[PDB]
Amino acid sequence: MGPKRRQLTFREKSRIIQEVEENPDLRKGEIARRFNIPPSTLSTILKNKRAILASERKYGVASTCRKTNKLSPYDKLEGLLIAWFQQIRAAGLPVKGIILKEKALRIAEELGMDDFTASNGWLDRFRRRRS
Template sequence: MPKLKRVVLSMKDKYEINERLEKGESATKLSNEYQVGKSTITDIKKQKMSINNFISLLDSSGGSTSRKTMKLAANTDLDDAVYKWFTQKRSQRDPISGPILCEKAVQFNKKLGGPTNFQASTGWLKRFKSRHGIRDLEIHREKLSADSFKIKLKDILKQENYDDEDRVYQIIQESEILDLVTNKADATTCASSTTSSDNEDENIIGACQAFTCLEIALRWFETQAESDHYQISVLKKVRDIAASKRVGLLGQTKIDGFFEH
C-alpha cells in the first residue's frame, strides 16, 4: 500500500476549518476535503484561540497567512524593529538587499542591547523572510530616476501652490521605531502635544490616550497567568498602531527633508 503524502496546512486553512466547524460542518467532511486525519481536525479545534490570535497578529503586521506554524522570532523586539524599518523603506521604494537588511539587524540589535554574539546570518535572513511572508527583497517593477522624480514632484507642488512648510507626508525615524518596540515612548510629551481637536469632546479618545492606556494594559497583562505569547503579541500590535498615530501628532518630516537625501 503506497505511503500517504503528509499534508501541512497553512494558518489560513486552519482558521477556515475552525470557521466551518463553528457553522456546523462535520470533522469527517473536513478531514476528507483537506486530506488530513480526524485527529488533526480535533487538534486544530483545540488550538482555535491561539490560531485566531496569531492570524490577528499577521493581519496587523502585514504578514502572510500562508505560513504553516505559529513560531515567532526569539527576539521579538528586534524582529519588530527590522520589519518596521523594512516596510517603511519598501513603501519609499528604496532598494533593499539581503546584506543591507542584515546590517540593519546588527545595528538594531546593538542599540536594543541584544545578545553580543548575535549574527544576522543567511539563516537568520531566511527565517525573517519566512516569518513575514517576504518572497523577494528586490523591487522588480521599473523605477523612475530619483532625481527625475524629485524634480517632477517639486513642479507639481508648485503648480498646486503647496508651501515649503506644508506637511505632506510622515517618516518614522529609526529612533522612533526603536521606541515603539521597547515601550520607551514618552506619554507626557505626547499629552502636551495633543491637538485641541482631541479635547473638544471628552467622549473621543485620542491616539495619545489610547497609547498610554494600552501601555498600562500591556504591562498588567504580561504579569497575568492567563496570558500567552500570542495574546501579548497581538496587544503589542494594537499598541503600535496607537503609537504610530501618536508620532503623527508629535510632528511630521517636512517635504524639503525628502529632497535633501
C-alpha cells in the same frame, strides 16, 4: 512509519474556522468530519481562533505553507527591522540586502543582543519567514 499527527497550514485552519462561523447550525463533529480531523483538533483550533487568524495575516501569502507561529529568539529585533524597511518600501523603494543586514546589526547593538550575528541562517530564515 506513517505520521502520527497531522499539521495544518494557517490557511487551512483559517478555512476550518470560517466554516464553523458560517454554519452555526451544524454539529461540531460534522464539521470535523468534513475536514477529516479529530473533534479534539477542531476544538483546539476554535479556541486559538484569534491567534490563528492573526498568524494568517502575519504570514500573508506564506499562510499557504506556514503551520506554526514559531518565533525567532531575536523577534524583538525583527519587529523593529520590519517597521524600518517597511517605511522605506512605503516610498516605493527597494531595500538592499546589504543595508538590511547592516541595520539589523545596529538594532542588535541598541537592544544589547551581544550574541546576534545576523548569521546567514538567520537572515535567510527571516527573508523566508516574514516573507
